[PDB]
Design a protein around this motif. Structure first.
Motif, PDB file in Angstrom:
ATOM      1  N   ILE A  35      39.508  26.415  44.515  1.00 27.30           N
ATOM      2  CA  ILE A  35      39.302  26.220  45.956  1.00 27.30           C
ATOM      3  C   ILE A  35      39.132  27.520  46.725  1.00 27.30           C
ATOM      4  O   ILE A  35      38.343  27.654  47.640  1.00 27.30           O
ATOM      5  N   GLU A  36      39.931  28.505  46.344  1.00 33.65           N
ATOM      6  CA  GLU A  36      39.821  29.821  46.941  1.00 33.65           C
ATOM      7  C   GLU A  36      38.387  30.315  46.816  1.00 33.65           C
ATOM      8  O   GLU A  36      37.815  30.781  47.799  1.00 33.65           O
ATOM      9  N   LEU A  37      37.825  30.195  45.627  1.00 32.61           N
ATOM     10  CA  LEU A  37      36.444  30.657  45.393  1.00 32.61           C
ATOM     11  C   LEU A  37      35.422  29.792  46.116  1.00 32.61           C
ATOM     12  O   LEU A  37      34.395  30.290  46.610  1.00 32.61           O
ATOM     13  N   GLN A  38      35.705  28.498  46.246  1.00 30.96           N
ATOM     14  CA  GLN A  38      34.789  27.697  47.035  1.00 30.96           C
ATOM     15  C   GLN A  38      34.795  28.075  48.519  1.00 30.96           C
ATOM     16  O   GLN A  38      33.858  27.707  49.258  1.00 30.96           O
ATOM     17  N   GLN A  39      35.841  28.755  48.957  1.00 31.43           N
ATOM     18  CA  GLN A  39      35.927  29.272  50.325  1.00 31.43           C
ATOM     19  C   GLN A  39      35.692  30.761  50.401  1.00 31.43           C
ATOM     20  O   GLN A  39      36.088  31.457  51.319  1.00 31.43           O
ATOM     21  N   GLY A  40      34.965  31.336  49.424  1.00 34.74           N
ATOM     22  CA  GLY A  40      34.502  32.703  49.586  1.00 34.74           C
ATOM     23  C   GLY A  40      35.521  33.768  49.290  1.00 34.74           C
ATOM     24  O   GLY A  40      35.276  34.922  49.633  1.00 34.74           O
ATOM     25  N   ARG A  41      36.640  33.461  48.642  1.00 38.90           N
ATOM     26  CA  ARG A  41      37.630  34.506  48.423  1.00 38.90           C
ATOM     27  C   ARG A  41      37.034  35.619  47.572  1.00 38.90           C
ATOM     28  O   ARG A  41      36.401  35.386  46.552  1.00 38.90           O
ATOM     29  N   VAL A  42      37.265  36.844  48.013  1.00 34.97           N
ATOM     30  CA  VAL A  42      36.987  38.042  47.220  1.00 34.97           C
ATOM     31  C   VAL A  42      38.320  38.790  47.137  1.00 34.97           C
ATOM     32  O   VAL A  42      39.202  38.645  48.004  1.00 34.97           O
ATOM     33  N   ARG A  43      38.414  39.561  46.069  1.00 32.50           N
ATOM     34  CA  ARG A  43      39.596  40.397  45.865  1.00 32.50           C
ATOM     35  C   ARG A  43      39.145  41.839  45.696  1.00 32.50           C
ATOM     36  O   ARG A  43      38.121  42.051  45.059  1.00 32.50           O
ATOM     37  N   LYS A  44      39.927  42.736  46.293  1.00 28.48           N
ATOM     38  CA  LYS A  44      39.626  44.165  46.194  1.00 28.48           C
ATOM     39  C   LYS A  44      40.855  44.874  45.650  1.00 28.48           C
ATOM     40  O   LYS A  44      41.898  44.282  45.365  1.00 28.48           O
ATOM     41  N   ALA A  45      40.724  46.173  45.451  1.00 29.16           N
ATOM     42  CA  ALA A  45      41.764  46.930  44.817  1.00 29.16           C
ATOM     43  C   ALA A  45      43.019  46.920  45.687  1.00 29.16           C
ATOM     44  O   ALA A  45      44.118  46.885  45.157  1.00 29.16           O
ATOM     45  N   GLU A  46      42.849  46.994  46.999  1.00 29.92           N
ATOM     46  CA  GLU A  46      44.014  47.237  47.876  1.00 29.92           C
ATOM     47  C   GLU A  46      44.905  46.008  47.807  1.00 29.92           C
ATOM     48  O   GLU A  46      44.528  44.848  47.973  1.00 29.92           O
ATOM     49  N   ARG A  47      46.178  46.318  47.514  1.00 31.83           N
ATOM     50  CA  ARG A  47      47.135  45.231  47.517  1.00 31.83           C
ATOM     51  C   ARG A  47      47.364  44.667  48.918  1.00 31.83           C
ATOM     52  O   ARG A  47      47.460  45.482  49.857  1.00 31.83           O
ATOM     53  N   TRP A  48      47.459  43.348  49.002  1.00 32.20           N
ATOM     54  CA  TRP A  48      47.835  42.585  50.235  1.00 32.20           C
ATOM     55  C   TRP A  48      46.778  42.809  51.344  1.00 32.20           C
ATOM     56  O   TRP A  48      47.105  42.690  52.524  1.00 32.20           O
ATOM     57  N   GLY A  49      45.553  43.003  50.879  1.00 37.62           N
ATOM     58  CA  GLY A  49      44.370  42.957  51.736  1.00 37.62           C
ATOM     59  C   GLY A  49      44.085  41.545  52.198  1.00 37.62           C
ATOM     60  O   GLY A  49      44.723  40.600  51.760  1.00 37.62           O
ATOM     61  N   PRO A  50      43.117  41.396  53.094  1.00 34.42           N
ATOM     62  CA  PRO A  50      42.796  40.107  53.683  1.00 34.42           C
ATOM     63  C   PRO A  50      42.135  39.151  52.707  1.00 34.42           C
ATOM     64  O   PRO A  50      41.663  39.509  51.621  1.00 34.42           O
ATOM     65  N   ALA A  51      42.075  37.905  53.146  1.00 35.19           N
ATOM     66  CA  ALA A  51      41.529  36.805  52.379  1.00 35.19           C
ATOM     67  C   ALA A  51      40.957  35.683  53.254  1.00 35.19           C
ATOM     68  O   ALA A  51      41.598  35.266  54.215  1.00 35.19           O
ATOM     69  N   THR A  52      39.772  35.171  52.896  1.00 33.77           N
ATOM     70  CA  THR A  52      39.325  33.923  53.499  1.00 33.77           C
ATOM     71  C   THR A  52      40.279  32.783  53.216  1.00 33.77           C
ATOM     72  O   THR A  52      40.526  31.953  54.080  1.00 33.77           O
ATOM     73  N   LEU A  53      40.830  32.740  52.010  1.00 30.58           N
ATOM     74  CA  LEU A  53      41.805  31.727  51.654  1.00 30.58           C
ATOM     75  C   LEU A  53      42.662  32.247  50.499  1.00 30.58           C
ATOM     76  O   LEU A  53      42.129  32.723  49.499  1.00 30.58           O
ATOM     77  N   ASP A  54      43.970  32.142  50.674  1.00 29.99           N
ATOM     78  CA  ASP A  54      44.973  32.452  49.655  1.00 29.99           C
ATOM     79  C   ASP A  54      45.905  31.256  49.498  1.00 29.99           C
ATOM     80  O   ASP A  54      46.559  30.882  50.465  1.00 29.99           O
ATOM     81  N   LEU A  55      45.881  30.659  48.318  1.00 28.14           N
ATOM     82  CA  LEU A  55      46.728  29.519  47.993  1.00 28.14           C
ATOM     83  C   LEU A  55      47.730  30.022  46.963  1.00 28.14           C
ATOM     84  O   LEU A  55      47.292  30.349  45.842  1.00 28.14           O
ATOM     85  N   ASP A  56      48.997  30.099  47.326  1.00 32.04           N
ATOM     86  CA  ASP A  56      50.041  30.560  46.419  1.00 32.04           C
ATOM     87  C   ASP A  56      50.998  29.406  46.144  1.00 32.04           C
ATOM     88  O   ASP A  56      51.424  28.694  47.029  1.00 32.04           O
TER      89      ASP A  56
END
Ligand SMILES: Nc1ncnc2c1ncn2[C@@H]1O[C@H](COP(=O)(O)CP(=O)(O)OP(=O)(O)O)[C@@H](O)[C@H]1O
Ligand SMILES: Nc1nc2c(c(=O)[nH]1)N=C(CO)CN2
Ligand SMILES: [Cl-]
Ligand SMILES: [Mg+2]
Ligand SMILES: [Mg+2]
Length: 158
Positions: free
Chosen positions: A76-97
């Motif tokens: 679902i995260e990927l269906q909503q455009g989530r990207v991940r970068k090196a920086e820890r605790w950077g922003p997200a379109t969607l984060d499901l934990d």
């Protein structure tokens, strides 16, 4: 089993993202939504060059194995455009934990339950407490008690 899922979004119109995420959570097989929290606007934990989050929590009844539920939340995260970068605790379109999976304790490379940092985060505990005020953690501690003790700032509605 009832899984408790934390929802965060701070990019790309967080309200739309969280509504989309809720619909998709309800479409996961062999599962159904039980309870949804209110939506809260919270200042970012971590890097400060990012927007405020919309944070929420959902209770999801499921017969899936925990790592299979993770596969689905990650999809679902990927269906909503989530990207991940090196920086820890950077922003997200969607984060499901996954905060909690019933009363289980899970220790694997892909999955640590209870979520490793949730007891330090009002933006996770307050929405959980709204939907599960009687909750007891696997270690025996009561959510209600932890909240009264840690005395985290109350959250503002989105
Ligand atoms: N309870 C859990 N819920 C979701 N992912 C978990 C998890 N325990 C371990 N993960 C692992 O965490 C990995 C990275 O997920 P991310 O979403 O990038 C971390 P984050 O949510 O940005 O930070 P955070 O965990 O401090 O909130 C996932 O690939 C996943 O395998
Ligand atoms: N306010 C808020 N800050 C965060 C959040 C979150 O959900 N809310 N999630 C993070 C990593 O996943 C890092 N920082
Ligand atoms: Cl615990
Ligand atoms: Mg995450
Ligand atoms: Mg997170």
């Amino acid at each position: 089993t009832v899984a408790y899922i934390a929802i965060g979004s701070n990019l790309a119109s967080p309200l739309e993202q969280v509504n989309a995420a809720l619909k998709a959570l309800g479409d996961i097989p062999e599962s159904h939504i039980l309870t949804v929290s209110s939506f809260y606007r919270t200042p970012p934990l971590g890097p400060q060059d990012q927007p405020d989050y919309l944070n929420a929590a959902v209770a999801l009844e499921t017969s899936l194995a925990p790592e299979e539920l993770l596969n689905h939340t990650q999809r679902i995260e990927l269906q909503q455009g989530r990207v991940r970068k090196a920086e820890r605790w950077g922003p997200a379109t969607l984060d499901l934990d996954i905060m909690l999976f019933g009363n289980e304790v899970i220790n694997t490379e892909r999955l640590t339950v209870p979520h490793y940092d949730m007891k330090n985060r009002g933006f996770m505990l307050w929405p959980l407490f709204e939907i599960a005020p009687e909750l007891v953690f696997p270690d025996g501690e009561m959510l209600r008690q932890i909240l009264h003790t840690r005395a985290f700032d109350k959250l503002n509605k989105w």
